[PDB]
Tab-separated table of C-alpha atoms in Angstrom:
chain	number	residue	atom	x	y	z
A	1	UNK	CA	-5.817	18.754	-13.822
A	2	UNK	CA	-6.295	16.163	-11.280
A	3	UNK	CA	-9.963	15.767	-9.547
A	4	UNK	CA	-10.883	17.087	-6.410
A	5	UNK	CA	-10.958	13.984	-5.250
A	6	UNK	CA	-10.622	10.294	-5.773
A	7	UNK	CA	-11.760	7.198	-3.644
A	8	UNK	CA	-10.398	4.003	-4.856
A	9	UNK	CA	-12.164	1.940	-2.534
A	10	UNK	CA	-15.553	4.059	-4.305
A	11	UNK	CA	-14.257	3.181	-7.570
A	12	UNK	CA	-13.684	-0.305	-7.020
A	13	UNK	CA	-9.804	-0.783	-6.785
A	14	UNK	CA	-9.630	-1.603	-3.420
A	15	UNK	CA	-10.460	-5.274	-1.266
A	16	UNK	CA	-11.317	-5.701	1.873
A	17	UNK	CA	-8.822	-4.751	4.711
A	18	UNK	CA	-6.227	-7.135	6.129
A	19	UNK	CA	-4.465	-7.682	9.377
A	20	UNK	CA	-0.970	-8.550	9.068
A	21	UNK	CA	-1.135	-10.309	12.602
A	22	UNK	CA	1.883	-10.760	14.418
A	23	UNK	CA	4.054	-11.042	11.231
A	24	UNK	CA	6.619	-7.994	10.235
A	25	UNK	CA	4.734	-8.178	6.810
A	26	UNK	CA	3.685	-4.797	6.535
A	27	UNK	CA	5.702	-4.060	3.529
A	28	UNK	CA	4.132	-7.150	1.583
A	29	UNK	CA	0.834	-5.812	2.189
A	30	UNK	CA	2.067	-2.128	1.446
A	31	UNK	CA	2.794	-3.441	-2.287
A	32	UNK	CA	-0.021	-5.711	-2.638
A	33	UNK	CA	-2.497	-2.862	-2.509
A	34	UNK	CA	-1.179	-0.708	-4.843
A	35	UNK	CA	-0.743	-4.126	-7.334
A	36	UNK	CA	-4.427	-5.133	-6.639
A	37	UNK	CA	-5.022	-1.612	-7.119
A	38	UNK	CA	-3.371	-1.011	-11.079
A	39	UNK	CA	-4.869	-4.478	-11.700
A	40	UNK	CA	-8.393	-3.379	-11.306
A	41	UNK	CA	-7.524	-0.200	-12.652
A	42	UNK	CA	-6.284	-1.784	-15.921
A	43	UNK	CA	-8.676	-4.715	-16.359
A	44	UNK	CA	-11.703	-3.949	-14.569
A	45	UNK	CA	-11.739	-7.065	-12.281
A	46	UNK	CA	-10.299	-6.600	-8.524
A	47	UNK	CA	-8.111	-9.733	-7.837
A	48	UNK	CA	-7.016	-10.111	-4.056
A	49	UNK	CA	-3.363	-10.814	-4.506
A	50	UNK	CA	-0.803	-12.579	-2.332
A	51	UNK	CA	1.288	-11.130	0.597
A	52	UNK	CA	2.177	-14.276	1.848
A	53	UNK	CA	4.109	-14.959	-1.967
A	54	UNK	CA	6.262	-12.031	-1.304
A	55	UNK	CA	6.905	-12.764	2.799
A	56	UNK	CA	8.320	-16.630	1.601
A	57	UNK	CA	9.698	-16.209	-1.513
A	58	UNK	CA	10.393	-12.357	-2.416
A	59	UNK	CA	13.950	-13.040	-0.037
A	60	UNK	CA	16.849	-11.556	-2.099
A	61	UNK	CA	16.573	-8.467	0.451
A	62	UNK	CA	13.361	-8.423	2.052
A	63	UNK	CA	13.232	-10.775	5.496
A	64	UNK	CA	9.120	-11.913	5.355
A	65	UNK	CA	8.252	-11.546	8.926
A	66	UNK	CA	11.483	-9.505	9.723
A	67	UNK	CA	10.443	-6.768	7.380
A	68	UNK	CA	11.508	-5.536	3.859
A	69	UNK	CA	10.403	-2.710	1.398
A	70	UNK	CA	8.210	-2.072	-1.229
A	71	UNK	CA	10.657	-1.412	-3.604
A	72	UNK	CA	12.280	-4.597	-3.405
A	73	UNK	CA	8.932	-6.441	-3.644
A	74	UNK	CA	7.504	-4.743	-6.983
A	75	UNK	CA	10.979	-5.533	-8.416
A	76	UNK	CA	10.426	-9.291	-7.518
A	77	UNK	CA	6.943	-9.416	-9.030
A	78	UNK	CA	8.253	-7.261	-11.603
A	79	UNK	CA	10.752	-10.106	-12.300
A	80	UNK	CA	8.759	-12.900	-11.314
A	81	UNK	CA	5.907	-12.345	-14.230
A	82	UNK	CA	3.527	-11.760	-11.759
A	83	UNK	CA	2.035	-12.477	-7.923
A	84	UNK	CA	-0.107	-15.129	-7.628
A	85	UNK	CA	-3.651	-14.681	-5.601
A	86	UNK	CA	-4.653	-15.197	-2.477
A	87	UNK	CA	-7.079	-17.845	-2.975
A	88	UNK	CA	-3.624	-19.575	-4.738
A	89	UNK	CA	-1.408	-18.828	-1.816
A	90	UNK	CA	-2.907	-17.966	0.944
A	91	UNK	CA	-1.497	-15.676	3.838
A	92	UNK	CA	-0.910	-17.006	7.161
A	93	UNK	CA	1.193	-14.644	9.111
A	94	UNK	CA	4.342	-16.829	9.342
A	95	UNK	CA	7.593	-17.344	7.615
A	96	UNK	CA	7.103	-19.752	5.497
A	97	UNK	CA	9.275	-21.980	2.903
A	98	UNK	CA	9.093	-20.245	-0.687
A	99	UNK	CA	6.300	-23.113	-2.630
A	100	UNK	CA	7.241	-22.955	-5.776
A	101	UNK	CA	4.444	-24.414	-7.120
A	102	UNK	CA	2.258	-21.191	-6.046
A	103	UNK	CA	5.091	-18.727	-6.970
A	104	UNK	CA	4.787	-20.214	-10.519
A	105	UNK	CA	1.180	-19.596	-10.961
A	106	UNK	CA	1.149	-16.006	-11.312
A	107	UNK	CA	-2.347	-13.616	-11.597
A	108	UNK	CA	-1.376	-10.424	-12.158
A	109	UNK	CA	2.148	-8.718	-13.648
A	110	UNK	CA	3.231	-5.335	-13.374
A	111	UNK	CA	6.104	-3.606	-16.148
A	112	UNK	CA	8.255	-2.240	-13.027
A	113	UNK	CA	7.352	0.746	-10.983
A	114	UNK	CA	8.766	3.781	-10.012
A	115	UNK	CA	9.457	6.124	-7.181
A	116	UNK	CA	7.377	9.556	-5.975
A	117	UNK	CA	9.784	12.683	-6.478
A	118	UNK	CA	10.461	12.779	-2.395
A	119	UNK	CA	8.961	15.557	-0.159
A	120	UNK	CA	6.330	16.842	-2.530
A	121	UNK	CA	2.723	16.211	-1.648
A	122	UNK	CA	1.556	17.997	-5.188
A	123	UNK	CA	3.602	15.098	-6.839
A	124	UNK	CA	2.219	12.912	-4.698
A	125	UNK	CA	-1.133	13.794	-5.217
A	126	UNK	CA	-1.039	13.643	-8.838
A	127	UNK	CA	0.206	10.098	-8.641
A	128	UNK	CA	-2.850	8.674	-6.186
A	129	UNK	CA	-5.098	10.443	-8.813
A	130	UNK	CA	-3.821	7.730	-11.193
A	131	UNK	CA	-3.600	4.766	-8.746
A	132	UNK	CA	-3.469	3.689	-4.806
A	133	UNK	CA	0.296	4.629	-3.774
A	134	UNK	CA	2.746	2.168	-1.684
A	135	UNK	CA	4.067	4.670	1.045
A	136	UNK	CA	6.035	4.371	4.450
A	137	UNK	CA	5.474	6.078	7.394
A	138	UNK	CA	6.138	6.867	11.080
A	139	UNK	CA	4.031	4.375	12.723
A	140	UNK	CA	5.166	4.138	16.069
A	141	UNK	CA	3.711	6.243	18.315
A	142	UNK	CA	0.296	6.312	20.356
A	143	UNK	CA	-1.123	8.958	18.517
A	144	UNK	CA	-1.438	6.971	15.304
A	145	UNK	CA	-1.892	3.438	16.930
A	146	UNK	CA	-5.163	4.277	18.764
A	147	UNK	CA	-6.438	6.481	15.772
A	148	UNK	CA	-10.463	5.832	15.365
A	149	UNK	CA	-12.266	8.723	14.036
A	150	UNK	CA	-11.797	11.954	11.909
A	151	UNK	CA	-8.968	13.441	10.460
A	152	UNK	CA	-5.373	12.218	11.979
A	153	UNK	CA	-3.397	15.662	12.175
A	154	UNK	CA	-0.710	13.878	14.911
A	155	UNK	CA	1.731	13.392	16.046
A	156	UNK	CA	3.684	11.693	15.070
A	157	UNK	CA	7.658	11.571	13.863
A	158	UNK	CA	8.985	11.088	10.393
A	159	UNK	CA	11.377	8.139	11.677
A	160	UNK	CA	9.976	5.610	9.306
A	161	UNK	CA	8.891	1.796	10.244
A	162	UNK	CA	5.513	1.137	8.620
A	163	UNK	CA	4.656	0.391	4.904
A	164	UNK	CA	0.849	1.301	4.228
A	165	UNK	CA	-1.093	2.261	0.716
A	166	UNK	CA	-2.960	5.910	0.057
A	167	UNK	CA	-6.621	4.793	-1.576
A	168	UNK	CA	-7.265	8.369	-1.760
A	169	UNK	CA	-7.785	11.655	-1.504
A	170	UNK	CA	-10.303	14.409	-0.474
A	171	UNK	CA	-11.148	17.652	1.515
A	172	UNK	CA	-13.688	17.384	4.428
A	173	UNK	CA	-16.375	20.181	4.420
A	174	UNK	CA	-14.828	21.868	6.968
A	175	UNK	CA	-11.920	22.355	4.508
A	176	UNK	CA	-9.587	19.487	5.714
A	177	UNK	CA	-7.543	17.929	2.982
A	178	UNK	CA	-6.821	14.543	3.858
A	179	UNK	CA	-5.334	11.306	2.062
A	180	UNK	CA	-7.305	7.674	2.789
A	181	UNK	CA	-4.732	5.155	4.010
A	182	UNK	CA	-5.705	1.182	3.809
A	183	UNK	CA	-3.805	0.104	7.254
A	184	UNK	CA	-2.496	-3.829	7.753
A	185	UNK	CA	-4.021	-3.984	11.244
A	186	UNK	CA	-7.597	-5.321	10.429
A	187	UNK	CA	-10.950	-3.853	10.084
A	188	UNK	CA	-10.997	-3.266	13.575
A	189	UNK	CA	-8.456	-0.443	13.549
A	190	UNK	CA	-9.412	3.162	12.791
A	191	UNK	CA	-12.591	3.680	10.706
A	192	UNK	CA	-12.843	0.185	9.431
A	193	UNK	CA	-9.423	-0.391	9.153
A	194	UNK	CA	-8.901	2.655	7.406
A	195	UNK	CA	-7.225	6.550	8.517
A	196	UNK	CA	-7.880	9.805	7.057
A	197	UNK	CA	-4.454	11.232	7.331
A	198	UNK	CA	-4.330	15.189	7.216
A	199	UNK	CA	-2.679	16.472	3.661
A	200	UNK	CA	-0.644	19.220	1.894
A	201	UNK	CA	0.844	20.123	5.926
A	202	UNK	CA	3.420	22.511	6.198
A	203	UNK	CA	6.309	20.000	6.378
A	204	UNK	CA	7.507	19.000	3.243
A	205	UNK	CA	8.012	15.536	4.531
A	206	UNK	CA	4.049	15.003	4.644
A	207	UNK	CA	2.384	13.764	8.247
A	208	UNK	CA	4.103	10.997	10.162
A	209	UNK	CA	6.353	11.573	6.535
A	210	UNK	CA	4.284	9.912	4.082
A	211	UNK	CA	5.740	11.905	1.464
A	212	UNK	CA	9.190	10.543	1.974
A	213	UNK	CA	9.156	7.225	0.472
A	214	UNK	CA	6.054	6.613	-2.283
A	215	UNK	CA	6.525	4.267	-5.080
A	216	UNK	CA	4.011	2.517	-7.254
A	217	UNK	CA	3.651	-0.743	-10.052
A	218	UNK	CA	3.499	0.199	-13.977
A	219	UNK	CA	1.179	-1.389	-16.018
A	220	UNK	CA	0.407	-0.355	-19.291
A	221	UNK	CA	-1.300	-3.276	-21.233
A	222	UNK	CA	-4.649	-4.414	-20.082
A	223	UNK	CA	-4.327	-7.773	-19.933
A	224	UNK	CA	-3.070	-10.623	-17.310
């Protein structure tokens, strides 16, 4: 039984949108949603978190600026004991040198996480009931890039090169499901930095293949 639909950003899970500038950070921000997101969730206090902790220190795979995966990065935190916040460690859309001294401060801490069964939007609509959802997607065409308004139905491919976060879910009144993705590209982009992507289509990929590689952050204690 999930709801017919959930808003994080309504319920209070979500901060205020980010540009990523010209950094290749996208991942970083992809996982810091969905980690600001299960904070919230858990402890009822929204804590912006740091992407600029994962693009300088999270470096056993991911690249900062050269680009990485969410995977990698809720494994570091994950490992880590935590990210540290924003206010802490600030981002600045540059590679910068790991500072230890912010790593080591941690905020919030996460169990592990763990990955969307792929291709399946009913799985993956069950799991953004519970939380916002770290997903990847087919970015790179002008379609999506000069979204503003409505429902996104394409096109775009399924070749994937952008990490992004669902916030939500819904069905307009005309009867258009959709799924609310928090973008990286400032407030500016889309309807305040924001895209209503169209839902449940008949590729089991998902639009521009969101459904191909969602993961999200466990947390099961409600403290920090």
């Amino acid at each position: 039984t999930v709801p017919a639909s959930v808003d994080w950003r309504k319920k209070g899970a979500v901060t205020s949108v980010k540009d990523q500038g010209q950094c290749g950070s996208c991942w970083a921000f992809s996982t810091i949603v969905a980690v600001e997101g299960i904070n919230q969730i858990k402890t009822n206090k929204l804590v912006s978190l740091s992407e600029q902790e994962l693009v300088d220190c999270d470096t056993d795979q991911n690249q900062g600026c050269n680009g990485g995966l969410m995977d990698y990065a809720f494994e570091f935190i994950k490992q880590r004991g935590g990210i540290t916040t924003e206010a802490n460690y600030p981002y600045e859309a540059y590679d910068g040198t790991c500072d230890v001294s912010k790593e080591n401060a941690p905020a919030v801490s996460i169990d592990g996480h763990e990955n969307v069964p792929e291709n399946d939007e009913n799985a993956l609509l069950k799991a953004v009931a519970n939380q916002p959802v770290s997903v990847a997607i087919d970015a790179g065409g002008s379609d999506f890039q000069f979204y503003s308004e409505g429902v996104f139905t394409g096109s775009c491919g399924t070749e994937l090169d952008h990490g992004v976060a669902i916030v939500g879910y819904g069905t307009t009144i005309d009867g258009t499901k959709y799924w609310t993705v928090k973008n990286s590209w400032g407030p500016e982009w889309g309807e305040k930095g924001y895209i209503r992507m169209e839902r449940g289509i008949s590729d089991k990929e998902g639009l521009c293949g969101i459904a191909m590689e969602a993961s999200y952050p466990i947390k099961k204690s409600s403290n920090n």
